[PDB]
Design a protein around this nucleic acid. Structure first.
Ligand code: FAD
Length: 456
DNA sequence: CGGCTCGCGCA
DNA sequence: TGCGCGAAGCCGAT
């Protein structure tokens, strides 16, 4: 539908109907940003063709009760900066509270919407909201993949077994879908408070706050400043200062050599395509560039592939046949230790390395990538059953990780526990043929004592 | 049949 | 640290 720099393969039709005479409405759910947003740019293009203005709507659901203040304040403060950003472009932002299946449907009829566009997310609840919205509206409904460089329905048509199978498919379509982002043209036609929503939600999440012995909060919110402007600053410092040493020090939690982009990438405050755009043009270590590109392009977008083609991505059924048979055969094996969710959450295990990894999670909200595997694999080794291990790993991840409730999390948890996108290894006790990690193995790769002493 | 995102022994 | 090997099941290029 019109546009020169717009790839039609990024947008697909969810519902057909006669185009309305009112302004087009963009349902911002996953990509919370103004710049480098294909969904917002496409919505403006439809608005320009029909000589109507564009408007952005955000529906605040009750999902924040499951999570904590750390994700609520991160998302809410970014939205406050987002509201000012669209105001400079004469784009109004409307924030609702309630079920999207009824709030968005009512808003379309009340505002007399002409075209409805939303971003793409492979989550189960996102599809449920779309189906409820479709039955409640009679206007065209579109969906744009503004999160992945290559659209999820275009990269692959089936669930990918391993990364080596998905590697050639993604890199083959890169020269077409890797382009520059055109500027967002301001609106030509002009036509709840965000502070009150933050205050009300915080009070409802105060009892569930993670506290210390002296009733002191554990979360440290000064590590990551939320917002679109700060996300660019984090990416800028990574390329200039940390990209050169990424390829050799990304497995060292004692060194802050990671991009620290997941909290911004999860909420959509920065575009992964923009990050790839600047990294490809940077003169850095070729090994470091290849290692990082395989992380933000291959494994990041294969998590969407895993969740899109596997509705049970957070279940034992999603595990492949060889993993299920191995885990089932070792169900009756005696575990060395058995810890409950409360003991795992408090970091009260016999392993000081595991406790240190949990302490980093509770304090900063972003545990190091290498220690995340050992954090999740040891849960399986010290749990009643593989189903309980998956339950605890998901619960702790979605509650304390700033990048939690993301396809990158469920795929990562399934990789560590169920071996998704992995292969079989030496047969062992309890864990069976799932990939095994040991405390001594971490000793030969990084200074373990420094990591434990940093987080008690 | 070749190649895959651990621990382990050895410079 | 860095390198080669072991141990394991399976996709897919043919
Ligand atoms: C058990 C487990 C749970 C995880 N939980 C989450 C989660 O809740 N949310 C989340 O976004 N990521 C999660 N990860 C994936 C990964 O650990 C994080 O993306 C990364 O550690 C965040 O730090 P970083 O962005 O600075 O790392 P970087 O090395 O800078 O990563 C760059 C980017 O690449 C992507 N990426 C990196 N590693 C992975 C990976 N293993 N799988 C998929 N994409 C990746 C992310 O978008 C990340 O922002 C989890 C991994 C595991 C093993």
């Amino acid at each position: 539908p019109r546009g020169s720099h717009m790839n039609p393969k990024r947008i697909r039709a969810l519902k057909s109907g006669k185009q309305g005479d009112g302004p087009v409405v963009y349902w911002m759910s996953r990509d919370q940003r103004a710049e480098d947003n294909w969904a917002l740019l496409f919505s403006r293009a439809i608005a320009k063709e029909a000589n109507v203005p564009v408007v952005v709507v955000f529906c605040l659901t009750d999902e924040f009760l499951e999570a904590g203040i750390r994700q609520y304040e991160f998302m809410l403060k970014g939205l406050q900066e987002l509201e000012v950003s669209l105001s400079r472009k004469k784009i109004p932002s409307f924030f609702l509270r309630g079920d999207p299946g009824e709030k968005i449907s009512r808003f379309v009829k009340d505002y007399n919407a002409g075209t409805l566009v939303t971003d793409f997310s492979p989550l189960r609840i996102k599809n449920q909201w779309i189906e409820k919205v479709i039955s409640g509206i009679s206007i065209p409904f579109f969906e744009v993949d503004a999160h992945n460089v290559v659209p999820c329905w275009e990269a692959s048509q089936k669930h990918e077994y391993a990364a080596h199978t998905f590697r050639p498919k993604l890199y083959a379509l890169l020269p077409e879908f890797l382009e520059e982002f055109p500027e967002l043209e301001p609106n030509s036609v002009t036509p709840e408070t965000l502070s009150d929503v933050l205050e009300t939600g915080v009070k409802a999440l105060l009892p569930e706050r993670a506290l210390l012995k002296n009733k002191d909060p554990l979360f440290e919110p000064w590590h990551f400043e939320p917002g679109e402007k700060a996300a660019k600053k984090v990416m800028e410092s990574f390329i200039a200062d940390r990209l050169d040493s990424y390829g050799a020090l990304r497995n060292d939690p004692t060194k802050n050599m990671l991009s620290n982009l997941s909290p911004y990438l999860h909420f959509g405050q920065i575009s992964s395509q923009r990050v790839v755009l600047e990294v490809e043009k940077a003169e850095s270590n070729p090994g470091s560039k290849k290692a990082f590109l395989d992380e933000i392009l291959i494994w990041k977008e294969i998590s969407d592939n895993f969740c899109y083609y596997n509705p049970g991505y957070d279940g034992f059924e999603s595990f492949p046949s060889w993993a299920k048979e191995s885990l089932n055969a070792h169900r009756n094996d005696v575990r060395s230790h058995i810890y409950t969710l409360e003991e795992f959450e408090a970091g009260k295990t016999h392993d000081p390395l595991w406790n240190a990894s949990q302490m980093e999670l509770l304090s900063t909200g972003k545990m190091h990538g290498y220690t995340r595997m050992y954090w999740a694999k040891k849960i399986l080794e010290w749990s009643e059953s593989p189903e309980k291990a998956l339950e605890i790993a998901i619960c702790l991840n979605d509650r304390y990780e700033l990048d939690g409730r993301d396809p990158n999390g469920y795929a990562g948890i399934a990789w560590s526990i169920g071996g998704v996108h992995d292969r079989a290894w030496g047969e062992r006790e309890v864990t069976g043929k799932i990939r095994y990690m040991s405390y001594e193995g971490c000793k030969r790769k990084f200074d373990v004592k420094l990591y434990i002493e940093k987080y008690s």
